[PDB]
Design a protein around this ligand. Sequence first.
Ligand SMILES: *[C@@H]1O[C@H](CO)[C@@H](O)[C@H](O)[C@H]1NC(C)=O
Ligand SMILES: *[C@@H]1O[C@H](CO)[C@@H](O)[C@H](O)[C@H]1NC(C)=O
Ligand SMILES: *[C@@H]1O[C@H](CO)[C@@H](O)[C@H](O)[C@H]1NC(C)=O
Ligand SMILES: *[C@@H]1O[C@H](CO)[C@@H](O)[C@H](O)[C@H]1NC(C)=O
Ligand SMILES: *[C@@H]1O[C@H](CO)[C@@H](O)[C@H](O)[C@H]1NC(C)=O
Ligand SMILES: *[C@@H]1O[C@H](CO)[C@@H](O)[C@H](O)[C@H]1NC(C)=O
Ligand SMILES: [Cl-]
Ligand SMILES: [Cl-]
Ligand code: NA
Lengths: 342, 189
Amino acid sequence: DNHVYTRAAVAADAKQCSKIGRDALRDGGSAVDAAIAALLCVGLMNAHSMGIGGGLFLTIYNSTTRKAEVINAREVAPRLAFATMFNSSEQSQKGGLSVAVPGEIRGYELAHQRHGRLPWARLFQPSIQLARQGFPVGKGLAAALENKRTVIEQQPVLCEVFCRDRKVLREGERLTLPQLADTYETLAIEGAQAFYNGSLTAQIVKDIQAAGGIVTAEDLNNYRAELIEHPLNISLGDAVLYMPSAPLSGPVLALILNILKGYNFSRESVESPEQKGLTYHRIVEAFRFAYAKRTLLGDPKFVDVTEVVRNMTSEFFAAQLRAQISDDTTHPISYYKPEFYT
Amino acid sequence: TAHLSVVAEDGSAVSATSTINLYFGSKVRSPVSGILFNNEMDDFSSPSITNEFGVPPSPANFIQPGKQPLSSMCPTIMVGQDGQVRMVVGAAGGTQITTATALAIIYNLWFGYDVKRAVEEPRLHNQLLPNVTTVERNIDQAVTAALETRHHHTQIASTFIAVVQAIVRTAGGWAAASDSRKGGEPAGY
Ligand SMILES: *[C@@H]1O[C@H](CO)[C@@H](O)[C@H](O)[C@H]1NC(C)=O
Ligand SMILES: *[C@@H]1O[C@H](CO)[C@@H](O)[C@H](O)[C@H]1NC(C)=O
Ligand SMILES: *[C@@H]1O[C@H](CO)[C@@H](O)[C@H](O)[C@H]1NC(C)=O
Ligand SMILES: *[C@@H]1O[C@H](CO)[C@@H](O)[C@H](O)[C@H]1NC(C)=O
Ligand SMILES: *[C@@H]1O[C@H](CO)[C@@H](O)[C@H](O)[C@H]1NC(C)=O
Ligand SMILES: *[C@@H]1O[C@H](CO)[C@@H](O)[C@H](O)[C@H]1NC(C)=O
Ligand SMILES: [Cl-]
Ligand SMILES: [Cl-]
Ligand code: NA
């Protein structure tokens, strides 16, 4: 309708998954239950984007405890991976060797153990039906299918589900995911264990390695989703913003907003073309300064980013960068001091 | 990548961004399980690969066994001083996630745009390397002009820049928006 709601809301990139999230809330689920049910659905309707073969982060806020937490369930490099394992973009983009260890299901399981109210199997139920019954291909997926027409049509295993008469499905056409339905059912019934150390594990390893990868059962056995009790935050006026730290881009977002807050943007900032143009120029300059520092970030378990992140979340640091933003001109790359070593 | 935002009736919230990386990830689908495997290894830097003219590898983001690759993802929840959620926001779209998320926040929190406009409003992006500023097709061309007169070279995104899902607390309750660039719609009660 209008999409203002008096009690609860789910915003997902497919209507049907937002609905599935909403129904979960309605049936008494937590915000986490709803997110998981919706996420499982998005893995189907926007299968090009995300799903149980990938990884995720969840930022979670509890209005009772008033605490925020983060769940890190991003994929990890397999135990056999090494720095020089790839020599071309193609090698790092296509095939089994490009696959990192999927965190998705562990992530759902950790979030659900900590905050779930519905049973685990209930979160899968609606998506199991969706994948068996099929659904019209939506706008996002149809454009992705189009964008990747060649590779899909040339690869029998993808064409198997993503084609109709050996050409990529188009918007409105029915997409059915019968294998995933079966896999989702197994997950619903056997739990997360089935993926990481159970009835799916050997097949997963075999598929990845058959495609030239190096993921092993051990990799899956050993994957752990991680609880982050103290996520990044920044103070913005009377609000606090919780977001993930490295290895995600919280620090980058933090530096952008902290640089820009010293200008005190308001409705007036965009009222006239003179103000609007300066405002946008200033935004682009904050982007450039923030991305200059981004190249120092990495997995904080493997690289020491403590001070880098301290600077990026420091308002004083931000004010120093804001002071080098010239209102009348942008600058060359070196001006912003991008760094590749500390 | 996909982002989604959730606020429950009790005022608890989830902002979650999830990804298999490129469209259809690695292009490896299990013929048995149906699982479509990520190509997240591509988010690492490699000393041997050059992605962009004059952009060096970032050794802080080299592959190590057990290491997680750098991500642009930044699922965010903004909470007011009273402990109530004010905004649940994030984006999909590679390196454009972080700038798009900043934009959605700026638009709602500072420019005063309601959540749907904050999501739908034209976006732009610069990530330093490469040097160019990318603008969406329907941006206010007075912005384009103010950028170019200040020596930004701009270019127009052939499709669109990022995908944002967002929820904002209003007097009437929770206003929700899904990005028309990808075709989502919200749902609630
Ligand atoms: C790339 O080159 C390195 C160094 O010789 C080698 O160890 C590795 O196996 C190669 N990888 C690929 C995917 O071609
Ligand atoms: C928040 O924390 C409180 C107190 O520990 C707990 O009772 C409640 O269920 C939690 N709610 C959510 C939505 O996580
Ligand atoms: C399951 O877990 C145990 C303990 O980690 C391990 O030794 C066993 O081999 C695993 N089974 C499968 C099927 O991965
Ligand atoms: C923000 O993070 C800092 C550093 O851990 C900490 O001092 C504080 O508890 C956090 N602020 C809020 C409002 O949670
Ligand atoms: C942090 O910023 C200060 C200047 O404010 C600078 O001296 C120092 O080099 C920075 N530290 C890092 C790791 O960038
Ligand atoms: C990048 O763009 C800016 C703005 O036009 C310009 O000054 C500079 O010469 C360009 N090149 C580099 C390497 O910074
Ligand atoms: Cl399938
Ligand atoms: Cl999305
Ligand atoms: Na809306």
